Amino acid sequence: QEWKEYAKRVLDEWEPKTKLGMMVKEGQITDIHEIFRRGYQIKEPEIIDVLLPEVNARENQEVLDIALTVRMTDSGRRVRFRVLAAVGNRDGYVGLGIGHGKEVGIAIRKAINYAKLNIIEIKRGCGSWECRCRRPHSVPFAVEGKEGSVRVRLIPGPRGLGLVIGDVGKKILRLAGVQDVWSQTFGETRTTVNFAKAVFNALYNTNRVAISPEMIERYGIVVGRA
């Protein structure tokens, strides 16, 4: 219950500034599923700390890309660090973020904060021909997501099959809780930022697919926590 007591400490010594922060602090909101699909803005990392306190674990925190960028000036070179990171719990909830700094540590901190701010909620299940089980071990059905030039299609896979995707998408899916999947990617996958954002968009798009009431039972669809 270390994460639970961490959440209690945050809720104690946190002073809300936004409407959603006030809702959480006063107690109108108790479960993270309430802050989604309502149009609210998440601008305080303390909200995510309180509602998903496990995202602060190192095992649940993943730094994806570190890049050095240069600005030219009459004096010389101005170096800056761009860090692309991802956080989340290994059940339904994942987030991705970008941070910039004069130092790698500052960039990492800002990227983690922005990933927490951008956290989303996904849907999991099983819709593969070779599995036909009813567990949230893979994506419920085939989805697509594109960022820039990279197009990523995620397809359900049989239980026990590893994550057949690049390293970046593999880490993102592992943080999101998905365990088995097949992938088809087109475009420049070496662009880590675009690849990660395409995987993130593909995971998010699971909520854009209309489904029938019986499909939930058929595919074992689970929203957010399981």
Part of the chain binding RNA (CB under 7 A), chosen from 17-25, 67-75, 104-112, 132-140 = 67-75
- Beta strand pairing call for 150-155 and 120-121: unpaired
| Nearest distance, CB of residue 96 and RNA, angstroms | 15
67 scored as a contact of RNA (CB under 7 A): yes
138 scored as a contact of RNA (CB under 7 A): no
Question: Tokens at residue 43, please?
Answer: 């601008």
181 scored as a contact of Zn ion (CB under 5 A): no
Q: Which residues pair with 175 in a beta bridge?
A: none
Q: Binding partner of residue 126 among Zn ion, RNA, none, CB under 5 to 8 Å per kind?
A: Zn ion
Comparing CB distances to RNA, the nearer of 28 and 184 is 184
| Count of residues that bind Zn ion according to CB under 5 A | 4
DSSP string, 49-98: HHHSGGGGSTTT-EEEEEEEEEEE-SS-EEEEEEEEEEEE-SSSEEEEEE
57 scored as a contact of RNA (CB under 7 A): no
CA distance 95 to 105: 19
For the CA atoms of 185, 188, 192, 194, what is the dihedral angle to 10 degrees? -80
| Nearest distance, CB of residue 197 and RNA, angstroms | 10
Q: Give residues 152-171 in contact with RNA (rule: CB under 7 A).
A: 155, 161-169
Measured CA to CA in angstroms, residue 66 lies from 80, 100, 151, 192 at distances of 10, 10, 22, 10
Binder among 51, 86, 96, 131 for Zn ion (CB under 5 A): 131
| Nearest distance, CB of residue 53 and Zn ion, angstroms | 30
